[PDB]
Design an enzyme around this catalytic site. Structure first.
Site, PDB file in Angstrom:
ATOM      1  CE  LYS A  13       9.338  15.445 -12.617  1.00 14.65           C
ATOM      2  NZ  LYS A  13       8.196  14.376 -13.384  1.00 14.65           N
ATOM      3  CG  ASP A  41       1.943   5.910  -5.697  1.00 18.96           C
ATOM      4  OD1 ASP A  41       1.591   5.372  -6.163  1.00 18.96           O
ATOM      5  OD2 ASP A  41       1.841   6.607  -7.297  1.00 18.96           O
TER       6      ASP A  41
END
Lengths: 48, 286, 670, 48
Positions: free
Chosen positions: B122, B213
């Site tokens: 990431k 989300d």
RNA sequence: CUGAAACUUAAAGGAAUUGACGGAAGGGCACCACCAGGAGUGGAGCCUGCGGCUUAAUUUGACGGGGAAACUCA
């Protein structure tokens, strides 16, 4: 006049990196020790 | 962009000079030539000039001279490179790259270790570039706080994977052989996973973490075996989480429950026989 | 703490008289080695530099000023070594003549002498093929106080004005190699003969450092005592000179080797060799127990890729599931589509011009090697490593090899040579049993069969040189190397070359390299000697703990002087940490040119050569690094990337290293 | 390097005049034959 | 209060003149910015472009008139 003692590979950085090929020399008449530069040799094959 | 093949063109002295650049750039705004010459503590001007030219032709150090003020500027790729060198000093990254998923603020590549096990990464590129210090500093602190979130989620028995390191804003994660429900078609034991997926909401809200989300694209389902079909549910909702003390958590919670019932009534055609978990019981649970 | 000092005038004259009191004290104590009544020994070696001189004429012309006929009347008949005492200056002399048919004999004469006297001709110019190399070889082996002198100055025209121009020509020639002195002296002048006799009697000779730190005896009488039928006891009667002799340390004899001591006897006490003897073995058996922890036993057979995994790829697993489908006649593609399952002077000149072709190509292309399409590089390059930087990678001395000599494990490994040599000179000045300047009776354990090779001690010298602790024990050591002037003949790194360092001579095949200092102590192995600068030469050889100079030669009996002197050097270090590795370069031409990727031609001939060599970096002789991209063609064609944009005049090079070890040593006779 | 011993005086580019003739050669180099280079006085010109 | 020396170092300092830099401030002035919306994309299948994978080659740059079985083909 002197009698040589060692080989001093001092590295000395800024601004110019001088690869110092210089000789520690013991003098004769007084018995104290000074450092000494060897000129113009790329190899220092002379002052052994 | 990021092209990771170019940092192995550099010697030991080149990232020593790059470490001197990142040390001198965190004290002043713009670092000039003699602070790189002096902070590095290395012998010659010639090696500093050669290393600075090596970073310049690899587009890692930008030369700037604004009227008798010589100076140098770090881009994204140079600080990515020096973070990966100090990750290499922690002897874990070894071989990098397959782009699977491009996010807004975090791009996902596919890496490996010296052992050869499958892992991912990431990166964090905030702003994509008019480089200052606030963008990369905010990427660094966001990566740090999600590393503590990541370790706290992994340490409490969740089905959230294992973290390793937070090397500046470069975040190295374990690969999971998992599929989304865009690829997934049908499963044998749907009510057991529905029980697990309300229990995940229950113990997140008991911990006080509210993942917002929580769409179909969030859930990554690992297939451990092909004969017995063992399962694991991986949840990626890390920047969109909100605390339990916030004022707007109610429609977030019923949105999460409403989306999971509509997604399981749409594709797999499975209806919830127990009632929905409402907000106040989870509020007293934390 | 302490107050300031205000030195008075009386304190100053006390300072001066005390320093001159102790300084005249130790100058006298340095000069009381030469008590010319009983305890004195001065060594004179007179060598003339042309064929047409007799050194007994120089002896005659020197001792006609001492006015003693009967010493010469003794000295004519058949004697070569003389012990002359003079009453004019009260000093004891010992004068050594050389045999002119052996160069090594002249080396043995002047390496023991406290005075080297060079004879010169006023008639014939000195030889550039004999006398120049006499001057250079003695000059590089080490000279004490020297005298330069003439004897043919009467043979030129008898007007002295012609003779002083000759004298100035000899002075200009002798200044070129001896700038410590400026006057070439005359034996035809009686007062100048008195002057040179005075200087050879009174003056303190300078000390040569390697020989005066081990102690040496010149021998006047040799006798033999039988102890066993296979070996007995030599008797040596001589005067000890140097740091002294101990009964436990070993003693080297030129042209004979190393021997072990039995007993000693001073007549001016009796001591013997105790249980602390240095054993006469070339490898210490305790060195077997020193190398007990092996670390790197890495095999090269079970390697899919090259040894670059510290700095390259991951080990790639290729589970080959080969299943055969049989329709009659089928290529690999359809069989891959069917069963996929997913879960003698002529020889000397011949070797001369092939080797001279090797260093001229080695000067032009340094270390490249060509590959044929028929030969495959797989079995050729098992043992090579393709590390990106030589001066940053982590090698180790401890790694094994099937090309190992088995006596590498039995080697004497010194950590710091600097503390070791100062330590060994401080105990060899400490427990010296007999100090120098004593008439000594020295006894040597010695085999019987070598007694034919000894000579008369008054016709030939018998130099006796002691050796230090573990000097007989072998190690890997280093030597400096500088080629002699007007020597363009090639030397490679594998031919027998005998080194003259100290008094021992040893035939060696020395490794050649460049003395550039490394953080990981690795160096570049060069195939031949560098013709420009001072190279370095390490090998397996016996150790020398005084940093003696090294002279390098091979015996060439075609000349009258049966020696080809190659170069010179000095004992540098005895280090096992200093290691050598060759570099292999595989050449390649960039075929086609593009902004990002470069097609390279004629590098290899197979795709799996590229697949094996997918890890190792590329570099250009123009000064640009690069990496490979994809194996394009079946003829070794592959794509590659670079740092910048290259043209058709650049060449792609590829570095591979395998480790090279030194070769053992053997002594040389004759 | 090392001179051969036959240096007894009693019993390649062309050489360069010395003494007064060298001063003649410098005079005719500088002022008799003035080299008008780019409006200036260029001593030691190369290919230009 | 009086008050050094060895040694080390090519600058230390005074006045004065301009301003890249501002994440100081204030204006404009923009649907490649927002509000009011509208059409949407990102969700589904398929075409195309880049990357990746494979190849003997998927020629190849960052739309290349780069539409496409021989040609274009590199």
């Amino acid at each position: 006049k002197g009698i040589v003692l060692e080989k001093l590979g001092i590295e000395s950085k800024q601004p110019n990196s001088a690869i110092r090929k210089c000789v520690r020399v013991q003098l004769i008449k007084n018995g104290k020790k000074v450092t000494a530069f060897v000129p113009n040799d790329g190899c220092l094959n002379f002052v052994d | 962009k990021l092209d990771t093949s170019h940092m192995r063109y550099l010697t030991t002295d080149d990232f020593r000079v790059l470490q001197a650049v990142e040390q001198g750039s965190r004290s002043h705004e713009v670092v000039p030539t003699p602070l790189i010459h002096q902070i590095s503590g290395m012998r010659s001007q010639s090696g500093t000039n050669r290393a600075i030219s090596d970073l310049a032709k690899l587009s890692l150090i930008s030369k700037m001279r604004n009227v008798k003020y010589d100076g140098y500027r770090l881009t994204y790729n140079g600080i990515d490179y020096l973070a990966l060198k100090t990750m290499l000093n922690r002897d874990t990254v070894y071989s990098v790259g397959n782009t699977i998923g491009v996010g807004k603020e975090s791009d996902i590549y596919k890496v490996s270790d010296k052992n050869g096990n499958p892992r991912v990464m990431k990166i964090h590129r905030l702003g994509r570039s008019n480089q200052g210090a606030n963008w990369m500093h905010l990427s660094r602190l966001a990566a740090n706080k999600e590393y503590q979130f990541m370790s706290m989620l992994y340490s409490k028995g969740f089905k959230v994977p294992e973290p390793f390191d937070n090397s500046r804003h470069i975040v190295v994660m374990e690969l999971i052989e998992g599929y989304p429900m865009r690829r997934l078609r049908k499963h044998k034991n749907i009510p057991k996973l529905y029980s697990d997926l309300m229990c995940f909401i229950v113990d997140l809200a008991n911990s006080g973490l509210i993942h917002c989300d929580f769409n179909e694209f969030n859930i990554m389902i690992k297939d451990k075996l092909e004969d017995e079909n063992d399962c694991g549910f991986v949840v990626i909702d890390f920047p969109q989480c909100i605390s339990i003390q916030h004022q707007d958590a109610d429609y977030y919670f019923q949105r999460d429950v409403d989306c999971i019932r509509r997604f399981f009534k749409k594709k797999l055609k499975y209806e919830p026989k127990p009632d929905s978990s409402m907000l106040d019981t989870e509020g007293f649970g934390d | 703490g302490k107050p300031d000092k205000q030195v008075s005038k009386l304190q100053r004259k006390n300072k001066a008289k005390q320093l001159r009191a102790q300084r005249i004290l130790d100058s006298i104590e340095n000069r009381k080695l030469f008590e010319g009544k009983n305890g004195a020994a001065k060594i004179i070696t007179i060598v003339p530099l042309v064929n047409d001189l007799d050194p007994l004429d120089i002896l005659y012309k020197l001792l006609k000023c001492a006015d003693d006929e009967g010493i010469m009347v003794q000295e004519v008949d058949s004697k070569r070594i003389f012990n002359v005492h003079i009453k004019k200056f009260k000093s004891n002399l010992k004068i050594i003549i050389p045999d002119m048919t052996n160069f090594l004999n002249i080396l043995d004469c002047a390496k023991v002498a406290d005075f080297v006297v060079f004879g010169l001709s006023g008639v014939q110019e000195v030889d550039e093929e004999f006398g120049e190399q006499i001057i250079r070889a003695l000059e590089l082996q080490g000279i004490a106080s020297y005298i330069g002198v003439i004897s043919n100055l009467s043979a030129v025209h008898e007007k002295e004005k012609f003779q002083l121009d000759v004298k100035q020509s000899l002075e200009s020639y002798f200044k070129h190699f001896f700038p410590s002195e400026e006057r070439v002296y005359n034996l035809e002048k009686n007062s100048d003969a008195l002057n040179v006799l005075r200087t050879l009697c009174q003056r303190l000779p300078r000390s040569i450092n390697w020989r005066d730190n081990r102690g040496y005896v010149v021998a006047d009488f040799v006798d033999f005592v039988e102890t066993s039928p296979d070996s007995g006891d030599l008797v040596i009667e001589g005067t000890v000179r140097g740091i002294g002799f101990n009964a436990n340390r070993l003693v080297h004899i030129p042209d004979f080797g190393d021997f072990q001591l039995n007993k000693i006897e001073k007549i001016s006490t009796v001591f013997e060799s105790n249980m602390n003897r240095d054993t006469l073995d070339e490898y210490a058996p305790e060195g077997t127990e020193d190398w007990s922890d092996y670390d790197e036993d890495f095999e090269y057979d079970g390697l899919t890729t090259a040894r670059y995994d510290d700095h390259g790829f991951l080990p790639g697993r290729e589970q080959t599931s080969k299943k055969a489908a049989v329709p009659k006649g089928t290529s690999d593609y359809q069989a891959k589509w069917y069963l996929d399952d997913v879960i003698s002077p002529e020889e000397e000149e011949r070797q001369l011009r092939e080797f001279r072709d090797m260093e001229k190509e080695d000067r032009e292309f340094p270390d490249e090697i060509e590959l044929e399409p028929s030969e495959s590089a797989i079995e050729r390059l098992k043992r090579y490593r393709g590390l990106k930087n030589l001066y940053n990678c982590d090698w180790q001395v401890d790694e094994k090899d099937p090309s190992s000599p088995a006596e590498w494990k039995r080697l004497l490994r010194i950590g710091n040579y600097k503390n070791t040599k100062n330590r060994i000179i401080k105990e060899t000045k400490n427990e010296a049993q007999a100090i120098a300047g004593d008439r000594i009776r020295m006894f040597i354990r010695f085999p019987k069969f070598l007694l034919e090779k000894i000579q008369d001690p008054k016709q030939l010298l018998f130099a006796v040189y002691g050796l230090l602790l573990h000097e007989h024990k072998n190690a890997v050591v280093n030597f400096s190397l500088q080629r002699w002037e007007q020597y363009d003949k090639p030397v490679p790194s594998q031919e027998p070359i005998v080194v003259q360092y100290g008094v021992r001579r040893y035939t060696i095949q020395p490794l050649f390299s460049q003395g550039s200092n490394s953080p990981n102590n690795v160096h570049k192995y060069e195939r031949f000697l560098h013709p420009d600068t001072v190279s370095v030469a390490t090998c397996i050889a016996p150790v020398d703990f005084t940093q003696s100079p090294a002279i390098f030669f091979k015996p060439s009996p075609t000349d009258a002087k049966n020696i080809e002197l190659i170069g010179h050097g000095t004992f540098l270090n005895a280090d096992h940490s200093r290691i050598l590795a060759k570099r292999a370069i595989l050449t390649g031409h960039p075929f086609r040119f593009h902004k990002t990727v470069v097609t390279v031609r004629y590098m290899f001939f197979r795709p799996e050569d590229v697949e094996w060599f997918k890890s190792i970096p590329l570099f250009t002789k123009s000064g640009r690094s690069g990496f490979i991209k994809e194996s394009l063609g079946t003829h070794g064609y592959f794509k590659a990337t670079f740092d910048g944009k290259l043209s058709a005049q650049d060449v792609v090079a590829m570095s591979l290293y395998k480790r090279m070890w030194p070769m053992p040593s053997l002594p040389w006779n004759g | 390097m090392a001179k051969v011993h036959g240096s007894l005086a009693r019993a390649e580019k062309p050489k360069k005049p010395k003494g007064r003739a060298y001063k003649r050669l410098l005079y005719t180099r500088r002022f008799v034959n003035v080299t008008l280079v780019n409006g200036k006085r260029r001593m030691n010109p190369g290919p230009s």
